[PDB]
Design a binder for this molecule. Sequence first.
Ligand SMILES: CC(=O)Nc1nnc(S(N)(=O)=O)s1
Ligand SMILES: [Zn+2]
Length: 257
Amino acid sequence: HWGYGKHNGPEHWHKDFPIAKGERQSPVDIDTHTAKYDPSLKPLSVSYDQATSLRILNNGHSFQVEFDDSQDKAVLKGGPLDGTYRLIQFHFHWGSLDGQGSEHTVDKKKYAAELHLVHWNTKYGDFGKAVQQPDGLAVLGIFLKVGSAKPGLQKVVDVLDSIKTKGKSADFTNFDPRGLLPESLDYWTYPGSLTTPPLLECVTWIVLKEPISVSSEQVLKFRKLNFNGEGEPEELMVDNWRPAQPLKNRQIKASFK
Ligand SMILES: CC(=O)Nc1nnc(S(N)(=O)=O)s1
Ligand SMILES: [Zn+2]
């Protein structure tokens, strides 16, 4: 099965998932001088005040916080989207060192981690149907840089001990994802894919220009997680990021100049 090690890592994925070499793979490097400003682009609409978190899971590749998506509780609209997209989960990608960890890069700069807020287009009825559609998902990508602590992240950091190994989960209610957003919602956007198998090309990527700051201590706890299950040999969960893929026939658009 796939992973991020020396024998099952991203360069190997294409043997089981040939779309890995597809035309709209993610992530990509955002070249800030060739991104096109598009005034036609609307502001993002983030409506998370009614969000309902349920659970946090070590899924063996990352950890994810899951939400109730049976109704329009927490949705993303606007930006380059038509239709409304419900929040289903968020997760992170991070590095073994502060100089790497993000999936997207900006002018080849890497950040310490990257947060993905995953949303699916309600017109398709359920998540499994949405991932088979070119406009099925919208993922909000937020960069993390090491500096001052982020108060809104600490509730997450504090429960990681409880889900240290693969398949562990814990109740995680009343978490407000608004505490994870930057002040500005300016963004870049491009059509792309899931960055983990099955790598389906169903994602409208929305990557925020402004990073959020987290402390060294906060990102250190991420690095204490395990890829393995309980009772197995310990392998620390680090460097669970895919490198940049060729842009090919695509234009990155910016909502700002
Ligand atoms: C179920 C689920 O949300 N799947 C994900 N797979 N890759 C994702 S990512 N890194 O592109 O946001 S989301
Ligand atoms: Zn992700």
